[PDB]
RNA sequence: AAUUCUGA
RNA sequence: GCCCGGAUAGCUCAGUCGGUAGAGCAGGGGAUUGAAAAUCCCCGUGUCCUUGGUUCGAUUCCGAGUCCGGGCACC
RNA sequence: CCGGGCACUCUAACGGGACUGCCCGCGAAAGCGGGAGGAAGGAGGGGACGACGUCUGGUCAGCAUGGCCCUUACGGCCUGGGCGACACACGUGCUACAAUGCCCACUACAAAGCGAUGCCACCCGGCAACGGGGAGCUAAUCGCAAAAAGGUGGGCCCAGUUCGGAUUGGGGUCUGCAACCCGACCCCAUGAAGCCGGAAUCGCUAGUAAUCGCGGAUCAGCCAUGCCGCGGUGAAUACG
């Protein structure tokens, strides 16, 4: 578990940041399952890569500290 | 043990009583080779003797261990499709081993939560001819004699 | 027992140090 | 094969026997255009491999028949 | 003495009795004991009303334990049952969620064995 | 007092 | 309706020819086979359905009540 | 700990000694029994070494190499998923069902190996994991390091419990660009089944079995309870 930082990948902010100014569309593909969803992101859906394809996962309040990988299953029929 | 007739390991004389047998009895109470936490219990029992009978735990041994020695037990054999479990004499050497063993097991049965208490008490009832170890003695002796039908099978 | 992570032997068998086994 | 393409299985009959293998196996597989897919696999399929039911492990050959008939 | 909730332990030391409370263990035990001058080697069998109500202070006032922790712990799990994160599932399915060997040993969070099998080894 | 092992 | 007998161990039955209660099979522990039994030792369990009177009192000796078991008729 | 000293302890190098040589019993001898002397006997206890050969055993995935097959992909690179997947089933192991016990406080005895972008003395903060500073060490000279059971004295008092620690909730530290899958530790709260285990079945004849702890390898860290070594206490039985 991290202790000093939020190890959130470069392209994450760089991308999202402009998307926050006036609240842009939504479709944001990705490959950074190893990051975190800091607040202010609410509403904006992300196409997380479960290893096979992009899952249109919506974002809401409650889910904050959680990561991107904890929202894109990697196996089927559990 | 097909070549040599094996060897009767030597018992180091006691370090309080000086008995090559007062040790053979502790050895059976020794779990995991902890002879210190074993002999302690035993010596704590000898104090339950001197604290419940002026009798010095010495004759309470040469008596409780002698009233348990089975004269003859049953050792099965098979001549060929013969489920005959023949009865026969016991080696003076064996006798002791069978005794001490039944003594510990029996001790480890009583409802006394401590320990030395159990050993002490079982030693009293066995010297006083009425301990669980003797219950196994008669039980064994019943099987014996009752089958003297197989006396011509003293291998 | 040798698996009780909150005792003496708990750490002995484990090989670590904690609130239940301070550094001498 | 009929579980990968998506078709559905019905084991109408399967029966063991003495030592090891299978005596008779009759199955019903559905799905659109199924008979046309398992019609060519109608014959006797030969196998050649080291015999596991032998002590020396000799190389042996085995034969088994596959029949196909639609549900009309 | 009805201490917390409905729990009246007696004939034992007033240090292990608190353990028999959902939300109190060895720690918080030899904790409310030091912070209240109550010798642990005593018994519920004999203790002044003061020691009781005082105990009820540094206990039923400090951390709001059974019922309400219980209510919250379930509420969190309930939260994990919002959109369904990975921890959310495996909990929805009643399985362990701490990266563990499920191919074998797991009867704890697996609802007993249902030997429901049938593989074979030797027909005709 | 206790059966069987095909065919490179 | 008459003549007779009997429940006591889960089952079947003996029994101071009045006090002192018992067997076989069941069952349990052990012993236990290559595998179950056959061998093999050890124990709890009650008013003798049972209603009493003499006897010091009764599982057994009288009446007798409830039922059970076996026979003899008539209709 | 000082100077001072090789008599011990030890460290490593070269030798002695045991050979059935000496007595007695048996036998033709070989050889066996017992006795002594000796620290040690009849191969003293361990290694290392494992024949002609068997198993068309296993290993083309450690390497090599015959032969076949593809060569803008059956090759090369990359983020990420997977090898960790669970209604089930078998094997080896770990922790247990406890009083010859667990928890708590204090104090002692080993051996074998291992440490420079490496092991860390000692202070300060944090209950702690852990973080600052900084000395010593190329190491029979400093450290890893406390060995543990035990000795010792204080409370539990037989209840699934102060036993047993699975599971789950909350909070953190550390490597690592990065711990959802999928890491190891820290604290609090959770305390499930298990009361010695049907049929069957494993190892060991002595410092062995059992029990208790320490080290190394790989490695940033680690799922290591695995493996290879080291040492503390230390049994029962063998008629046949
Ligand atoms: Mg046949």
């Amino acid at each position: 578990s991290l202790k000093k930082g939020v190890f959130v990948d470069d392209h994450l902010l760089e991308k999202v940041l402009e998307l926050n100014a006036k609240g842009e569309k939504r479709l944001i593909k990705t490959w950074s399952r190893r990051s975190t969803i800091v607040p202010e992101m609410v509403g904006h859906t992300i196409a997380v890569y479960n290893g096979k394809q992009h899952v249109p996962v919506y974002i809401t309040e409650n889910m904050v500290g959680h990561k991107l990988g904890e929202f894109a299953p990697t196996r089927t029929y559990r | 043990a097909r070549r040599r007739r094996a060897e009767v390991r030597q018992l180091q004389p006691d370090l309080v009583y000086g008995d090559v047998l007062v040790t053979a009895f502790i050895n059976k109470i020794m779990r995991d080779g902890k002879k210190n936490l074993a002999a302690r219990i035993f010596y704590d029992a000898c104090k339950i003797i001197q604290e419940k009978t002026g009798q010095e735990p010495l004759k309470v041994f040469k008596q409780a261990v002698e009233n348990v020695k089975p004269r003859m037990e049953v050792r099965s054999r098979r001549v060929g499709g013969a489920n005959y479990q023949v009865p026969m004499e016991v080696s003076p050497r064996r006798q002791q081993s069978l005794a001490l063993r039944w003594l510990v097991q029996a001790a480890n049965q009583r409802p006394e939560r401590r320990a030395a208490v159990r050993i002490a008490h079982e030693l009293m009832d066995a010297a006083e001819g009425k301990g669980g170890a003797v219950k196994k003695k008669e039980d064994v002796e019943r099987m014996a004699e009752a089958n003297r039908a197989y006396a011509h099978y003293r291998w | 027992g040798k698996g009780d992570r909150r005792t003496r032997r708990g750490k002995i068998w484990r090989g670590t140090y904690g609130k239940y086994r301070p550094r001498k | 094969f009929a579980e990968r393409q998506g078709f559905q299985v019905e084991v109408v009959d399967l029966t063991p026997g003495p030592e090891a293998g299978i005596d008779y196996a009759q199955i019903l597989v559905k799905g659109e255009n199924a008979y046309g897919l398992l019609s060519p696999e109608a014959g006797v399929h030969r196998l050649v491999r080291p015999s596991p039911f032998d002590a020396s492990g000799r190389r042996h050959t085995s034969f088994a028949g596959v029949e196909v008939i639609p549900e009309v | 003495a009805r201490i917390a909730g409905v729990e009246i332990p007696r004939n034992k030391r007033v240090d292990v009795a608190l353990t028999y409370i959902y939300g109190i263990g060895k720690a918080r035990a030899k904790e409310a004991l030091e912070k209240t001058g109550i010798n642990p080697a005593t018994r519920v069998k004999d203790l002044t009303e003061a020691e009781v109500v005082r105990l009820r202070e540094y206990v039923e006032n400090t951390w709001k334990l059974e019922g309400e922790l219980r209510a919250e712990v379930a509420a969190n799990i309930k939260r994990l049952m919002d959109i369904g994160c990975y921890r959310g599932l495996r909990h929805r399915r009643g399985l362990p969620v701490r990266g563990q060997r499920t191919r074998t040993n797991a009867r704890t969070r697996k609802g007993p064995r249902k030997t429901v099998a049938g593989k074979k080894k030797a027909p005709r």
Side-chain angles (χ1 to χ4, degrees), chain E residues 1-95:
Chain E
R2 287 186 79 184
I3 314 175
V6 193
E7 301 179 304
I8 307 75
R10 296 176 186 173
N11 285 297
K12 289 185 175 182
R13 304 214 307 167
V14 296
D15 60 353
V16 189
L18 299 306
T19 301
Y20 289 168
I21 286 62
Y22 179 106
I24 301 174
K26 175 74 170 188
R28 304 184 184 183
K30 287 183 174 179
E31 184 269 0
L33 284 175
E34 61 186 58
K35 315 295 288 300
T36 54
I38 298 176
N39 180 241
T42 62
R43 310 287 186 168
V44 179
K45 189 169 184 173
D46 23 58
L47 76 184
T48 303
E49 283 283 303
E51 295 166 288
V52 185
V53 183
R54 176 182 180 178
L55 193 297
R56 172 184 296 183
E57 300 299 61
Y58 201 58
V59 170
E60 191 166 56
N61 292 74
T62 300
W63 29 55
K64 76 178 188 300
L65 304 180
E66 181 42 56
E68 173 172 294
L69 285 174
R70 182 79 70 174
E72 181 179 58
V73 179
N76 302 118
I77 301 178
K78 200 289 228 60
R79 193 186 72 73
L80 291 148
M81 172 255 273
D82 59 351
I83 287 295
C85 52
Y86 178 64
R87 290 165 46 60
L89 311 178
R90 309 297 294 173
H91 258 10
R92 276 328 80 67
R93 306 155 184 160
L95 311 168

Side-chain angles (χ1 to χ4, degrees), chain B residues 4-5 29 32-34 36 40 97 113-115 118:
Chain B
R4 262 59 196 183
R5 185 185 168 185
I29 326 297
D32 309 304
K34 289 168 54 60
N36 192 245
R40 174 180 284 292
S97 296
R113 312 212 291 193
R114 287 193 63 182
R118 302 186 287 181

Side-chain angles (χ1 to χ4, degrees), chain D:
Chain D
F1 169 62
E3 287 183 63
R4 304 185 84 74
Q5 267 49 53
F7 310 131
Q8 188 169 304
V9 189
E10 181 185 58
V11 61
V12 177
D13 206 356
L14 175 158
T15 174
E19 292 214 78
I22 189 177
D23 194 307
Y24 176 67
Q26 186 197 348
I27 295 184
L28 173 49
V29 176
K30 302 91 163 191
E32 300 173 302
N33 293 294
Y35 176 56
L37 275 58
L38 293 174
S39 293
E41 300 296 307
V44 182
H45 305 62
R46 177 176 84 147
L47 168 131
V48 178
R49 61 84 180 280
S51 183
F53 321 97
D54 188 301
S56 306
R58 309 178 188 175
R59 192 181 180 190
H60 275 152
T61 303
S62 299
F63 300 75
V66 175
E67 306 92 80
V68 201
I69 43 180
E71 176 189 299
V72 51

